[PDB]
Every structure is written in structure tokens, then in C-alpha cells.
Amino acid sequence: PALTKSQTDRLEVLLNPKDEISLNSGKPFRELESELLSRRKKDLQQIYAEERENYLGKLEREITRFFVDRGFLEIKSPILIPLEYIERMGIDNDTELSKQIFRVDKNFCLRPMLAPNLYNYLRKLDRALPDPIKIFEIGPCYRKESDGKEHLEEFTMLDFSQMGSGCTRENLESIITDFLNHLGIDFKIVGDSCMVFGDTLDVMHGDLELSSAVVGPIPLDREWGIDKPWIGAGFGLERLLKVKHDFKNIKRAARSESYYNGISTNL
Amino acid sequence: PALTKSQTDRLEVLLNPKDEISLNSGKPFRELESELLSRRKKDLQQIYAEERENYLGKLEREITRFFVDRGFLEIKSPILIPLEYIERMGIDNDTELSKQIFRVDKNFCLRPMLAPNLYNYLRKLDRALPDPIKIFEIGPCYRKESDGKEHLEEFTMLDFSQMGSGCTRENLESIITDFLNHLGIDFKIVGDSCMVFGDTLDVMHGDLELSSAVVGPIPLDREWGIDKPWIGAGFGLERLLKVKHDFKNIKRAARSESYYNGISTNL
Numbered sequence A, B: 001p002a003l004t005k006s007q008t009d010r011l012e013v014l015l016n017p018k019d020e021i022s023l024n025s026g027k028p029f030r031e032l033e034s035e036l037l038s039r040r041k042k043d044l045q046q047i048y049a050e051e052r053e054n055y056l057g058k059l060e061r062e063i064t065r066f067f068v069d070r071g072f073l074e075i076k077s078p079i080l081i082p083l084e085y086i087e088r089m090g091i092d093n094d095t096e097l098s099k100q101i102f103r104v105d106k107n108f109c110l111r112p113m114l115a116p117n118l119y120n121y122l123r124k125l126d127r128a129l130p131d132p133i134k135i136f137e138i139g140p141c142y143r144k145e146s147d148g149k150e151h152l153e154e155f156t157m158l159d160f161s162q163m164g165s166g167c168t169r170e171n172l173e174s175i176i177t178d179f180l181n182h183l184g185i186d187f188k189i190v191g192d193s194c195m196v197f198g199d200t201l202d203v204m205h206g207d208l209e210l211s212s213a214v215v216g217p218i219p220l221d222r223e224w225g226i227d228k229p230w231i232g233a234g235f236g237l238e239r240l241l242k243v244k245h246d247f248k249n250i251k252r253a254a255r256s257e258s259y260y261n262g263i264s265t266n267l
């Protein structure tokens, strides 16, 4: 007959992009599932025998090397941050980002973004390091958005910043260009046409936003004690993974108990 | 005169054990503070100019290389986990670690250990991978215990497990020995003298517990679908860093806005 929805869902979970098998012919739901199962089992086994690195962790280690080798300091800051940091980010309790905050206790939350801890480091480091100040962080970030397709509730941000001299948009577009060229991902920076400083740039791969990027100074810097030019960009690693491996669903790239390196773990 | 308490706190924040400056003599507080501010500013400059890797990230990457080399698959599983996983770990709403949990919504919590997600990986991978199953994860864990001196509220665990053949106490002690020999840390393993399976092991550095390790099976295995022998050990990376760098206070090893690579950021 014709594959029911559960049979369709079940095969979509077992399918990978490299799979060539004819997913429409005379075979029952159930040759097809068994075939994919055998393919996905051999995929885990090959992983276990020859590689054994997690994709999310591996990409994290590769991005780290890129920025360290470019003069950027590697920051590991708290994931649990004061709720007051969200307030000085300008996310008041009527904005749309305001409703996506995982609160913990009364006073704390899971950081939805890396910027506020990075604002603080930039302020403290400016007392001890020579111009310009270049820092970056990679790590977990949380938001109650999960439209499922392009959006996770638990994801991994990269965020880098330069502060002081050299902080132009053509320098910022030159860092993003080397980064994505090193990753092997094509892009496409949209924004205002003749924007010098102050406004955001988007890094696109198709209809997929890989990053929002900022050419400071911006009025928010005063709330953080930052008084200096700066440029910076935030990238979601799961979207990057989605691009390199052609994942259909971004959940294939996330921290998970259901997928490992894009392979279903329910075999 | 003799130092006040705000003054003594200031010098302890700026001190490092490599320092030989005599914290007791005829010098004024400001003279000692300025020497230390000098030493610490140059420590970060040297870090920014030539090193640039964070101690916590860098230690995480080297532990991964070690365990991948030995045949352990690298896992990246969720940090926000269901509250029900906690109770299935033997913490009822009456136990001691139950009060220390960071609840997020009404269902989920910040994981205080890696065991539940690793249980699920062990059960799922048995299906697909040959005997024995060897896995490990490194990442954030959250406990409301933080007496400060040796506990952190936000910390980083390594947790490794083998399941199937080779799950003997002898081979659990051999892994741990190779690992701490690799990281250059003296240790001693305390346990039941005649314990074969079922009980825990404490790996100690003097008074500081580095790890609790387990020679399964244990009764808890029923709740996670595990019916094979296994061995496992959980380790704290900030504790490892505290011993390796002789940190007086474990705060200096953590995710923090206050200390970079053991060095205060308030200079």
C-alpha cells in the first residue's frame, strides 16, 4: 500500500542525505526500514572504529583554533548568568526575546546569548591588555524558541569581538570571510548599503542566517562601561553543522539523546 | 600598619603561589598591591600575546584526545534534562542531593551529573556497536552545593563508562591510573578492601576527592534498561585544574568573570 505517516516519520529519521535508495517503489515499509537500520548501524560502527569524535565538539575545537591563531583570547564564562544582565542588554519584559528566557531561581537564568559576559571581559581586559582587544567564546545558549526547523532551545553560540583600533566593517567582513572560507561554507552578507558603524549585518547561506554581526560603537555600550569602537559577530554552530553535512533538520546537529553525529540512536 | 581585611582580601585575589614576595614586612599595602598588579598584568599580557587558550577549554580538549585514543566514543548530550531522570537516579524528593538541583520549568532541570544521559547512550548503542561499549562525556553540571572552598555551583565533569566485557575493578583502576598519570596528578584509591562489584571507589588527592568510580552492576541498572556489567568514573575538571596549578581556591579554575586562567580580571 501507501506508507502511513508513522512509517514516513520513521523512515525520515533513519534516512541520511547520502542515501540513494528509491524511497518510492514496490518495497514494503518494512524492507526499507530494515535496510536503513542496517545502513545506520554500519555508520555508528564505522564512527566507533575509526573517528569517535562528536561533530559538535569537533567543530568547537576547530573554531577555537581558528580564532586563537588569529590573536583572539579564548573565554569560558558562566552559562548561568544574572537576570539583571538580560535587563541591561535592553531586553525588557515586552520584547520578543524577553519571553524566551529560561529563568532558574529568582535572580538568574540560562544565558540566551554570549554578549553580556563578553561586554564585561572587554571592560576588565581593557585595563590590562594592549589595543586592540580580541576575545571570543563558544558555548551553550538557551531560548524558548523551537520552531524545530531552524531553531533549537539548547544551542551553541560562537561569539567573537574586537575592541579599539581596526574595528571597521570591512575588517569585520574580512574576519567572517576567512572563517567561513576555512569552514568551506558559502555566504553572503546583507545589511544597509552604506552603513559605516552602528548597525547589524546578516551572514546568509541561502535563506539560513548563519550570523548577525555588529559594527559598534552602539548606544548600548554605555550600560556596560564600554566606551570604545568594536566589531563582532555571533554564529550558531548547529546551523554551521547543518550546512556542512546537509542535515534536513537542525535537530540532527544538536546536543541530543536521539541523534549522534546526525545518525538516529533509536535503532 | 598591619593590613586591614579589605586589604588582605585584595592581596589574596592578586596573589599566585609562584610569587615569593614576603606578605609580611615593612612595606605599605599600596606598594605590595602595585607589585602584584604589575606581576598579574604581565601574566595576562603574556597569556594574550603567546598562549590565548583557556585552561578549562584546553584541559577539556586534551582529556577528549586521551579518551578517543583509548577507544571511547565522545558524547555531547543535553545539559537541560527532565526532572524525572533525577528521581530515576535514586534522588527522591527526600534525599540530600535533591535539594541542590536547579529546576528550570516544571519538567526540566540543569543536570547535576552525566550518569542519566550516559545510561541512555549505553542502552541505545548496545543495539549497534560491538562489545565492549566505551563512551565518555565532558561538560557543565550544576549543583546548588558550593561551600566555595572545593565545591562550585557550576562545574565541569568528565564521565567515562565501559559496558560488556572487560568491566573489572582491575581495569577500572587501570584506566584511572593511566589518566591521572597522563595529567601528572598523585592519587590513591580508597574503597572496600575486598569489593568485587557493586560498590563505589573514591579517587583522592590527599583530602580532595577527584573522582567517584563505580564497578557495576548495581541495582539502579534496572531503571535504565541496563542488564550488563559496566565500569565508570566521574571526575571534576576544575578540581583537576586546582591540583595541577596549586590553586588555593577552586573559583580560580571555574567559568568566571573574576579570574582568567587563575589570574584575577580586576586589575
Ligand SMILES: Nc1ncnc2c1ncn2[C@@H]1O[C@H](COP(=O)(O)OP(=O)(O)NP(=O)(O)O)[C@@H](O)[C@H]1O
Residues within 6 Å of the ligand: A113, A143, A145, A150, A151, A152, A153, A155, A157, A209, A210, A211, A212, A234, A235, A236, A237, A238, A239
Ligand atoms: N534558537 C536558535 N537555534 C539555533 N541557532 C540560533 C538560535 N538563536 C540564535 N542562533 C544563532 O545565533 C546567531 C546570533 O544570534 P541572534 O542574532 O540573537 O539570533 P536571531 O537574530 O534571533 N536570528 P534567529 O535565531 O533566526 O531568529 C544567529 O545568527 C544563529 O546562527
Ligand SMILES: Nc1ncnc2c1ncn2[C@@H]1O[C@H](COP(=O)(O)OP(=O)(O)NP(=O)(O)O)[C@@H](O)[C@H]1O
Residues within 6 Å of the ligand: B113, B143, B145, B146, B150, B151, B152, B153, B155, B156, B157, B209, B210, B211, B212, B234, B235, B236, B237, B238, B239
Ligand atoms: N560542586 C562541585 N564542584 C566541583 N566539582 C564537583 C562538584 N560536585 C561534584 N564534583 C566533581 O564531580 C565528581 C563526580 O561527582 P559525584 O561523585 O556525584 O560527586 P560526589 O560523590 O558528591 N563527591 P563530593 O560532591 O565532593 O562530595 C566528583 O568526584 C568531583 O570531582
Ligand SMILES: N[C@@H](Cc1ccccc1Cl)C(=O)O
Residues within 6 Å of the ligand: A114, A115, A116, A118, A119, A122, A159, A160, A161, A162, A212, A213, A214, A230, A231, A232, A233, A234
Ligand atoms: N552583540 C554581539 C556580542 C558582543 C557583545 C559585546 C561586545 C562585543 C560583541 Cl561581538 C554580537 O552581535 O556579536
Ligand SMILES: N[C@@H](Cc1ccccc1Cl)C(=O)O
Residues within 6 Å of the ligand: B114, B115, B116, B118, B119, B122, B159, B160, B161, B212, B213, B214, B230, B231, B232, B233, B234
Ligand atoms: N553513575 C556513574 C555514571 C554512569 C551512569 C550510567 C552509566 C555509566 C556511568 Cl559512568 C558514576 O557516577 O560514575
